[PDB]
PDB file of C-alpha atoms in Angstrom:
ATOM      1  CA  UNK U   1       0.000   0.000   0.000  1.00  0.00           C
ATOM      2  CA  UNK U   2       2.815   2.375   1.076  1.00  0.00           C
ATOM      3  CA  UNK U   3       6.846   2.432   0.632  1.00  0.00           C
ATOM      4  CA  UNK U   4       8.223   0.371   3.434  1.00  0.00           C
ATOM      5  CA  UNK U   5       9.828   2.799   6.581  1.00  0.00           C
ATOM      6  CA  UNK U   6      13.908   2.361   5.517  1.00  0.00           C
ATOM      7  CA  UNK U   7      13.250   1.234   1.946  1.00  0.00           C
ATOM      8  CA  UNK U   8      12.169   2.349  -0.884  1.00  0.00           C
ATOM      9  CA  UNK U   9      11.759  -0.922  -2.511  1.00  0.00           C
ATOM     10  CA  UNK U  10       9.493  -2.717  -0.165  1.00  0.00           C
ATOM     11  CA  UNK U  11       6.044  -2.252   0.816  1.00  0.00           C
ATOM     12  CA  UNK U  12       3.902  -1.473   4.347  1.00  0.00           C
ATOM     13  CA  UNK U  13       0.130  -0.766   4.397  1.00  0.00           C
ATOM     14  CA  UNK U  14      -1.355   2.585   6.018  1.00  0.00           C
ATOM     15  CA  UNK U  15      -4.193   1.821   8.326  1.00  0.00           C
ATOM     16  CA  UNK U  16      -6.181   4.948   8.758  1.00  0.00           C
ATOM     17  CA  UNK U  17      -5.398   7.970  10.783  1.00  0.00           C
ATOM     18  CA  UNK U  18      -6.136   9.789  13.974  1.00  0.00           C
ATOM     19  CA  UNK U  19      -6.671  12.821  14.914  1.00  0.00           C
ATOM     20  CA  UNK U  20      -6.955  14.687  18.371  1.00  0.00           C
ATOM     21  CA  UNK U  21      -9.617  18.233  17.645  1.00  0.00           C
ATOM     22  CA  UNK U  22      -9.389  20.565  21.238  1.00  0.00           C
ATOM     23  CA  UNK U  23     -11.934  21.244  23.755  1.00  0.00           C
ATOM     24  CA  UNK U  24     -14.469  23.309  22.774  1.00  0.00           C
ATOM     25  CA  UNK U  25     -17.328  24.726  25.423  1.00  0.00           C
ATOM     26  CA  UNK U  26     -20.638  26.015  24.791  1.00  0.00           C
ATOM     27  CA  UNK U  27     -23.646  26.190  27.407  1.00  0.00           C
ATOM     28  CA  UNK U  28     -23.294  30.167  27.499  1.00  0.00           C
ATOM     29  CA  UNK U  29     -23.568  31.184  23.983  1.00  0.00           C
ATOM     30  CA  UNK U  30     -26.203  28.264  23.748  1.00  0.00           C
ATOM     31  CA  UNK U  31     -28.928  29.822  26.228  1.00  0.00           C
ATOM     32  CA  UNK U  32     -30.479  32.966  24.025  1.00  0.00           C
ATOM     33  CA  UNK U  33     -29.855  35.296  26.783  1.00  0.00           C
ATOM     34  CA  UNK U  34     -27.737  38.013  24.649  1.00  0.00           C
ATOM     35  CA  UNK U  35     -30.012  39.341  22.261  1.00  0.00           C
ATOM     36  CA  UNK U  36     -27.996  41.514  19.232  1.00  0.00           C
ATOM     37  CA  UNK U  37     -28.262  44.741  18.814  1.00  0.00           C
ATOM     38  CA  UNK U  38     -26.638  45.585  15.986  1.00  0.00           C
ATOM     39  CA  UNK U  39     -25.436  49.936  15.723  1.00  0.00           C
ATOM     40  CA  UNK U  40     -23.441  52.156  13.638  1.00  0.00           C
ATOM     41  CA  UNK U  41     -21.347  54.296  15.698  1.00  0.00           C
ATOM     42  CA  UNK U  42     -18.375  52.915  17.820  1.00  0.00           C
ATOM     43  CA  UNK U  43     -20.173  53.726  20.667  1.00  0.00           C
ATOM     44  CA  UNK U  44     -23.524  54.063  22.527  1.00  0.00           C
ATOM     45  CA  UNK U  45     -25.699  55.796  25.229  1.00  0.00           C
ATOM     46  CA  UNK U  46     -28.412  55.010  27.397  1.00  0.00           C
ATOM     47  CA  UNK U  47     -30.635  57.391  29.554  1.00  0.00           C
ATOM     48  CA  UNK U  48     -30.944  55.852  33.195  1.00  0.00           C
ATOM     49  CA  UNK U  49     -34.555  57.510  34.625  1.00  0.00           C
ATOM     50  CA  UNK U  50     -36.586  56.512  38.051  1.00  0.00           C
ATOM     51  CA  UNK U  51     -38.946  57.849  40.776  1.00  0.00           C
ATOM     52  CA  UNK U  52     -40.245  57.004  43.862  1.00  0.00           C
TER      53      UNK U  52
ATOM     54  CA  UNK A   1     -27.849  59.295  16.844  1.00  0.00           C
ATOM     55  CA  UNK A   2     -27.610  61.745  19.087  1.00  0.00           C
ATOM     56  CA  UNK A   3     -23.926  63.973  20.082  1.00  0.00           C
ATOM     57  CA  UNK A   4     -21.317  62.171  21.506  1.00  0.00           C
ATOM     58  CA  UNK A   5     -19.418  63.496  24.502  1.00  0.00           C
ATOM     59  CA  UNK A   6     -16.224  65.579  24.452  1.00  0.00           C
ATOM     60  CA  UNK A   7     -17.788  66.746  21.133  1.00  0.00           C
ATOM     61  CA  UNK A   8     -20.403  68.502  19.361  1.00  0.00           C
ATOM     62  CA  UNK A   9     -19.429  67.524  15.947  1.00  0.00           C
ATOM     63  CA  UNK A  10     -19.294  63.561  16.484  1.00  0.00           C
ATOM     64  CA  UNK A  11     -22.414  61.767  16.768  1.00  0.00           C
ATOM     65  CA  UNK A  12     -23.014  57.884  19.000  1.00  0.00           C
ATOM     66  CA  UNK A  13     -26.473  55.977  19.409  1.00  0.00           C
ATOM     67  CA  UNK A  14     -28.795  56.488  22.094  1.00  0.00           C
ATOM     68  CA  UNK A  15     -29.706  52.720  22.453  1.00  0.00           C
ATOM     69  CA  UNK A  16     -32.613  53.222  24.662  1.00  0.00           C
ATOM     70  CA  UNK A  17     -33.840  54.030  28.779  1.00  0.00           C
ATOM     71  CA  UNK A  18     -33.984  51.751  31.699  1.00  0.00           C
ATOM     72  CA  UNK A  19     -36.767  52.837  34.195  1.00  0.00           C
ATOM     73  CA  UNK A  20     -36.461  51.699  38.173  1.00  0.00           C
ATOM     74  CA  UNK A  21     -40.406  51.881  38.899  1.00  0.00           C
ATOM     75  CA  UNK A  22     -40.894  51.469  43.107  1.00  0.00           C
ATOM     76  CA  UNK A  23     -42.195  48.428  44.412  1.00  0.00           C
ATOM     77  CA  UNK A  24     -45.924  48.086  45.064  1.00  0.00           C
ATOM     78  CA  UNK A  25     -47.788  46.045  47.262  1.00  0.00           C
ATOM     79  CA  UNK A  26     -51.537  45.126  46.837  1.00  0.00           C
ATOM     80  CA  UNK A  27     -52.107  41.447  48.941  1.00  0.00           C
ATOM     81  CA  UNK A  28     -54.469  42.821  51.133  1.00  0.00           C
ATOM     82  CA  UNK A  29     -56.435  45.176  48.525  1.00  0.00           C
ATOM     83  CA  UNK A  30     -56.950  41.979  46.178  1.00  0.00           C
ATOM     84  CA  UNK A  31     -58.072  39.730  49.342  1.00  0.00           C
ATOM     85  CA  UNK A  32     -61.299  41.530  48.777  1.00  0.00           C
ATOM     86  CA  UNK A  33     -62.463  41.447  52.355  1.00  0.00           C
ATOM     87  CA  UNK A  34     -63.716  44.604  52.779  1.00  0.00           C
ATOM     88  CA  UNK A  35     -66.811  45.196  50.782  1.00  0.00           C
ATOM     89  CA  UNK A  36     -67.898  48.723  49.201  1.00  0.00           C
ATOM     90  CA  UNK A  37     -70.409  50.415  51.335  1.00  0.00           C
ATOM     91  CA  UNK A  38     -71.270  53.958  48.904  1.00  0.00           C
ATOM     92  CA  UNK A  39     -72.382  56.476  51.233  1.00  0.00           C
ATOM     93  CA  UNK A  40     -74.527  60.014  50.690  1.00  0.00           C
ATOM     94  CA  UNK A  41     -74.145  61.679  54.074  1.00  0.00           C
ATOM     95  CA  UNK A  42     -71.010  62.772  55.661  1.00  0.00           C
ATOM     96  CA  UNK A  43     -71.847  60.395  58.987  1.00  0.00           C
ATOM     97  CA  UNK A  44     -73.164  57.476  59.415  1.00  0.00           C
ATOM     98  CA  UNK A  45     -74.352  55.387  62.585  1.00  0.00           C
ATOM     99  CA  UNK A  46     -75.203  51.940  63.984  1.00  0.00           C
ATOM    100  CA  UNK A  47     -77.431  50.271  66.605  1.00  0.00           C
ATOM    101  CA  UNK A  48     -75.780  47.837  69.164  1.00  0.00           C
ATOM    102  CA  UNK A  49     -78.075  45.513  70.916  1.00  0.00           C
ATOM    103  CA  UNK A  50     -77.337  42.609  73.106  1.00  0.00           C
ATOM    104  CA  UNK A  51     -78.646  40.599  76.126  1.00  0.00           C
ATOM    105  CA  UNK A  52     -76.903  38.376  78.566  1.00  0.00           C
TER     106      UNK A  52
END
């Protein structure tokens, strides 16, 4: 199947591959909490108002 | 888009307002014990009778 390991003129098969993909975490960005508000301006205000 | 601070020539977003209404309580106005008694004078009186 493939060239041998100190040889080029003899033969060893390849069986398959693995592979080893990192941790990747969710759970936060999974829960619709953040809604998107999408803007044009680099930044933004908000008017803070109460009463009693 | 409203002015930005530090300048009058720059605009940013006014997202929105946050209110901080007071807390209310009504337990004992929705118990409904005390029944509406509509009255014409100013006064009104009541007889108390009782034997032993």
């Amino acid at each position: 199947l493939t060239n041998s390991e100190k040889s080029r003129f003899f033969l060893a098969d390849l069986t398959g591959e693995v592979q080893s993909i990192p941790n990747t975490y969710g759970y936060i960005s999974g829960l619709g909490l953040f809604r998107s508000a999408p803007q044009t301006q680099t930044t933004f205000l908000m008017d803070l108002t109460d009463w009693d």
